[PDB]
Design a protein around this ligand. Sequence first.
Ligand code: 2GZ
Ligand code: CA
Ligand code: CA
Ligand code: CA
Ligand code: CA
Ligand code: ZN
Length: 316
Amino acid sequence: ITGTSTVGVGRGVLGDQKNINTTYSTYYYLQDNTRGNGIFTYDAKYRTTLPGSLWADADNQFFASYDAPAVDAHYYAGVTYDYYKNVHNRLSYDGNNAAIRSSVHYSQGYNNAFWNGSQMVYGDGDGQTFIPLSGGIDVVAHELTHAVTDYTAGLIYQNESGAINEAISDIFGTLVEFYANKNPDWEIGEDVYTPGISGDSLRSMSDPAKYGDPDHYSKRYTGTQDNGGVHINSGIINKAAYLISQGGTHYGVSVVGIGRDKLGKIFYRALTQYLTPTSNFSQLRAAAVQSATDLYGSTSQEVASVKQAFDAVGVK
Ligand SMILES: CC(C)C[C@H](NP(=O)(O)CNC(=O)OCc1ccccc1)C(=O)NCC(C)(C)C
Ligand SMILES: [Ca+2]
Ligand SMILES: [Ca+2]
Ligand SMILES: [Ca+2]
Ligand SMILES: [Ca+2]
Ligand SMILES: [Zn+2]
């Protein structure tokens, strides 16, 4: 909407206070004009028709319980935008400052979040499996990264390409979490998963097997559930990414860690210059090796570490 840029204040899902960029025109809207062509957050009002209504508030204060998922979707979309712009020189998900749209309060008891081809969508959770999913910065960045993937590599959402698609979202979700630097880890969704259980998460990149996800190609799922295991086989690539960044010895194969920033550069380059819609795990290895070669040189530690990590997870 047309209005003047303002700054509201509210509390997120976890009870933390934050400032948010809003727009004033009669109401204060969750419309952040400071980033690209805007970040826009909508109320789906417990229904499934999208996007719903652009979030309107009378006083620019967002401290109601109902406000919390909107505050976080809006704010964490901003952080994710900043990460891509500042770290990778990418302007929004399409590289041309596309408006970023999110809807919260989607459906009832909805234990998921997704990119629907055009926008991000967040359930509130059922209060047991999840609390409102926009409360996780890794979750928000995971969803926005699906848009990035769709505009770039275009990885088809099934089988190996789909597992790469998933891992890319977990990898950048985690890198954005580190970028924001509030309780960062290599776990996925820990801030919004199972409020009654401390210390767990939806997935682990450092040890995917802790939740039964494969950490080696020999343990890949080959059935038809979950689009051929896109959220399962992602563990193999998540583990490789974790090893590239942090190092470790995995099934007897030692990897020298090169750090998060280089992991991010290598995978961002792979995603945007080498991966295609049908890339499989072997092709991702090749893409990552080539990306590291481009950035650091064929004889570099970075290249050696990428090879070590894929060796460790059984991807040749
Ligand atoms: C980061 C977590 C919190 C959310 C994450 N959601 P996602 O974006 O991967 C769900 N993806 C999904 O719904 O794709 C299917 C799809 C395809 C085209 C248009 C709309 C929807 C996830 O891992 N979902 C899978 C669960 C088993 C955890 C629910
Ligand atoms: Ca208010
Ligand atoms: Ca965390
Ligand atoms: Ca996390
Ligand atoms: Ca939990
Ligand atoms: Zn996903």
